[PDB]
C-alpha cells in the first residue's frame, strides 16, 4: 500500500516543481 503512495508522491513532486519553474523561468 505504501510503495505506490511513495512513488506517486515522487512523481507528483517532480511535476509540481516542473510547473513552478515553468512559470518562474
Q: Which three cell numbers stand for residue 13?
A: 513532486
x/- contact string, 1-25, with a copy of itself (CB under 8 A)? x--xx-xxxxxx-xxx-xx-xxx--
Return the DSSP state at 25. Answer: -
Q: CB of residue 24 vs a copy of itself: minimum separation in angstroms?
A: 10
Q: CB of residue 23 vs a copy of itself: minimum separation in angstroms?
A: 5
Which residues in 1-15 are b (16+ Cβ under 10 Å) and which e?
eeeeeeeeeeeeeee
- Applying CB under 8 A, the residues found at the interface with a copy of itself are 1, 4-5, 7-12, 14-16, 18-19, 21-23
Amino acid at each position: 500500500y505504501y510503495k505506490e503512495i511513495a512513488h506517486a508522491l515522487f512523481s507528483a513532486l517532480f511535476a509540481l516543481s516542473e510547473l513552478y519553474i515553468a512559470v518562474r523561468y
